[PDB]
Amino acid sequence: TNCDREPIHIPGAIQPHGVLLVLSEPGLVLTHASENAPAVLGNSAEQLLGAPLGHFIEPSVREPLEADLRSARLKQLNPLKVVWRVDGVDRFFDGIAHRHQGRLILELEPSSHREAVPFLSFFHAVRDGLSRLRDARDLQELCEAVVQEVRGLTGFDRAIIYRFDAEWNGSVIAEARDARADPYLGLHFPASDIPRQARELYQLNWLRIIPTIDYQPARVRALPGHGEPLDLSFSVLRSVSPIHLEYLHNMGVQASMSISLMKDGKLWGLISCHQVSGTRYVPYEVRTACEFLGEVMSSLLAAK
Amino acid sequence: TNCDREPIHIPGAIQPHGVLLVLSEPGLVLTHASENAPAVLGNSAEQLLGAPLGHFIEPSVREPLEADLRSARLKQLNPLKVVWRVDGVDRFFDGIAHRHQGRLILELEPSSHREAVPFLSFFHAVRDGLSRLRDARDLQELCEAVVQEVRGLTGFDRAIIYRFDAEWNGSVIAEARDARADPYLGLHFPASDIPRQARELYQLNWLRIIPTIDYQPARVRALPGHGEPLDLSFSVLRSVSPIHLEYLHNMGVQASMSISLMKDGKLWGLISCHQVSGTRYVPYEVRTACEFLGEVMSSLLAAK
Ligand SMILES: C=CC1=C(C)/C(=C/c2[nH]c(/C=C3N=C(/C=C4\NC(=O)C(C)=C4C=C)C(C)=C\3CCC(=O)O)c(CCC(=O)O)c2C)NC1=O
Numbered sequence: 001t002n003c004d005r006e007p008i009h010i011p012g013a014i015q016p017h018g019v020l021l022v023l024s025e026p027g028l029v030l031t032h033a034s035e036n037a038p039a040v041l042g043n044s045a046e047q048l049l050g051a052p053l054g055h056f057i058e059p060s061v062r063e064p065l066e067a068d069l070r071s072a073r074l075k076q077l078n079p080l081k082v083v084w085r086v087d088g089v090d091r092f093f094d095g096i097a098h099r100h101q102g103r104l105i106l107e108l109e110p111s112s113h114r115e116a117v118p119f120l121s122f123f124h125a126v127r128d129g130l131s132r133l134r135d136a137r138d139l140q141e142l143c144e145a146v147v148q149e150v151r152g153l154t155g156f157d158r159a160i161i162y163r164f165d166a167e168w169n170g171s172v173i174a175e176a177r178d179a180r181a182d183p184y185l186g187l188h189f190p191a192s193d194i195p196r197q198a199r200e201l202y203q204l205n206w207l208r209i210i211p212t213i214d215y216q217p218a219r220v221r222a223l224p225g226h227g228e229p230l231d232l233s234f235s236v237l238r239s240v241s242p243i244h245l246e247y248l249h250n251m252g253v254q255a256s257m258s259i260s261l262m263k264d265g266k267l268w269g270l271i272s273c274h275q276v277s278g279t280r281y282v283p284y285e286v287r288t289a290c291e292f293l294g295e296v297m298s299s300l301l302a303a304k
Numbered sequence: 305t306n307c308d309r310e311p312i313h314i315p316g317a318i319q320p321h322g323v324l325l326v327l328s329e330p331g332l333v334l335t336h337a338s339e340n341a342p343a344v345l346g347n348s349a350e351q352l353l354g355a356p357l358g359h360f361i362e363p364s365v366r367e368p369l370e371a372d373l374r375s376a377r378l379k380q381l382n383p384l385k386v387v388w389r390v391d392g393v394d395r396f397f398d399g400i401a402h403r404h405q406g407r408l409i410l411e412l413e414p415s416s417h418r419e420a421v422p423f424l425s426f427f428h429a430v431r432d433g434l435s436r437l438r439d440a441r442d443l444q445e446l447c448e449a450v451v452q453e454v455r456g457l458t459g460f461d462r463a464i465i466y467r468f469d470a471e472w473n474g475s476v477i478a479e480a481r482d483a484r485a486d487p488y489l490g491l492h493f494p495a496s497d498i499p500r501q502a503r504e505l506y507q508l509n510w511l512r513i514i515p516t517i518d519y520q521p522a523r524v525r526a527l528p529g530h531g532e533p534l535d536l537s538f539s540v541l542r543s544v545s546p547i548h549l550e551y552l553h554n555m556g557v558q559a560s561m562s563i564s565l566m567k568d569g570k571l572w573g574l575i576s577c578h579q580v581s582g583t584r585y586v587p588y589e590v591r592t593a594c595e596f597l598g599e600v601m602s603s604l605l606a607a608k
């Protein structure tokens with residue numbers, strides 16, 4: 001059971017298209033920072049570690065951001081509007097913050113389509129999607145509607161429903177795809193392809209995204225005394241298992257995204273998506289709309 | 305069965321806080337217009353009838369609005385951004401358009417909180433709401449969660465779940481309310497309180513809102529030759545039955561909003577809301593978030 005032993009939740013590094021910070025409470029002093037901060041934020045780790053978050057935030061946005069980070073309803077406040085100011089120039093980010101194992105983690109991803117009406121695309125996506133899912137008359141139609149919808153919103157080359165059986169083996173029961181992607185519909189795979197510790201994690205954190213499998217992991221630096229491993233179980237930017245990156249590579253997949261499907265509190269399956277020849281940095285609104293449809297499908301597994 | 309006979313779908317008038325227009329296709333010539341247009345739009349019916357819609361729209365917004373109104377996916381494009389320009393001054397509206405009985409109907413409601421991030425409140429409302437509804441372990445908890453959520457979002461003094469029995473009598477099975485509202489929990493009412501033609505309409509159109517029961521109905525004027533009754537079955541501003549306005553008055557209700565709950569294609573119940581001492585012009589994002597939660601609850605009636 002070597003597969004089941006890799007501690008995927010404490011890799012010590014993140015996917016470098018975003019930045020990860022850890023903040024003290026209540027002061028919001030930065031105790032950790034991913035080392036790709038120069039490229040993404042325009043500041044080095046030395047400038048960041050030990051500094052209060054506010055020193056880097058555009059002032060008209062400072063108070064509210066800080067109030068949100070200190071709030072107990074943090075989970076319901078995401079995404080946070082983070083405007084990072086360095087040398088009189090502003091960079092914009094969606095901040096996604098959460099608390100886990102006593103740490104306050106703030107992940108920053110570059111803001112997309114800043115000219116679009118914010119959240120209008122989420123609004124249409126979940127409204128149109130919900131009606132499509134409600135029209136399904138049975139489990140197969142539900143599965144088909146979901147993959148069609150997710151592929152439509154994301155542009156992924158392939159989207160499937162992967163269903164687990166009683167021994168945790170899986171089966172591709174529905175598939176939507178572009179013609180350039182080989183069909184995986186009907187294939188069954190052994191349980192070890194998604195090992196135990198991964199399934200346990202995916203029962204708790206329902207989303208994972210890997211916009212490119214070729215990336216340099218960015219180590220998370222910390223202040224002296226704060227170097228114990230950082231539990232990234234709920235971190236959107238968590239660097240993923242290298243063994244899994246090889247599996248995608250061998251499968252001919254350049255990018256991936258999956259969403260847990262839950263039933264009676266247990267992992268029932270996944271919505272799994274692949275981009276076969278190119279990257280896929282899915283915008284936040286789209287990604288979150290897909291998670292939402294996943295929750296809806298999960299709620300309907302009891303019925304259909 | 306006098307109750308069942310009133311033709312509620314062709315009252316010839318609307319609630320005057322919005323404006324209703326009928327547009328020809330494909331030219332978008334205005335063939336009908338509610339007579340409260342001077343107060344709401346700043347133009348008279350004489351100026352409007354027979355004129356093309358574009359003459360009244362701010363030019364940078366004209367092409368897209370017209371393209372949307374001509375689209376077959378109209379239902380998925382609502383709400384429309386309508387900027388009404390009269391004497392160099394702009395007024396802003398959410399346009400809600402639909403097609404029914406061969407007519408293209410455009411309803412205009414003043415845009416609310418224009419400084420808030422558009423659709424951000426819908427995003428949080430349906431995300432937080434969905435998780436609250438999914439935590440319900442049975443039908444009662446589901447009903448309780450829904451009324452608590454709807455009351456929370458709208459500020460209504462009372463929100464209930466009204467469930468129909470086999471002979472179309474109803475029962476108040478869950479209730480959330482402010483202390484100033486009498487409790488209706490547990491009361492049963494005869495079928496005639498929501499007569500047959502109303503129930504049929506509510507199986508098709510899942511939302512109705514009456515922001516004040518004291519209002520002067522605004523007659524819908526039409527060009528000569530176009531004066532047949534206008535079928536307002538799917539019109540948000542449809543003037544409601546005067547008999548029902550008396551029922552609310554006698555019940556001590558100043559404003560109301562209800563949402564159809566559907567199961568197996570049949571009307572199962574309603575989410576009904578009341579404001580006891582004041583009006584209630586519920587913003588579009590909130591109203592639509594509530595309809596959405598209603599659809600979710602309806603989808604879950606099969607399971608719980
Ligand atoms: C069509 C079928 C299909 C399968 C089966 C599939 C497997 C799969 N394996 C995964 C993770 C994983 N897979 C593995 C490990 C292994 N994998 C192995 O084949 C072996 C031999 C090991 C180890 C001995 C690990 C460790 C993870 C966790 C990745 C992480 O979250 O860090 C994930 C989640 C991450 C993602 O969404 O890409 C999927 C979906 N994806 C698919 O679309």
Ligand SMILES: C=CC1=C(C)/C(=C/c2[nH]c(/C=C3N=C(/C=C4\NC(=O)C(C)=C4C=C)C(C)=C\3CCC(=O)O)c(CCC(=O)O)c2C)NC1=O
Pocket residue numbers: 306307308310312466474476488493496497498499502512514543544545547548551560561562574576577
């Ligand atoms: C707590 C209980 C409770 C009840 C029972 C209730 C009844 C009720 N009656 C309604 C419509 C109506 N009710 C009536 C008619 C009648 N009504 C009568 O008591 C009689 C005697 C007639 C006619 C003989 C009609 C015609 C409508 C349709 C209104 C419309 O859509 O135009 C509606 C939909 C409009 C709205 O949301 O306000 C409700 C909810 N509301 C509640 O909260």
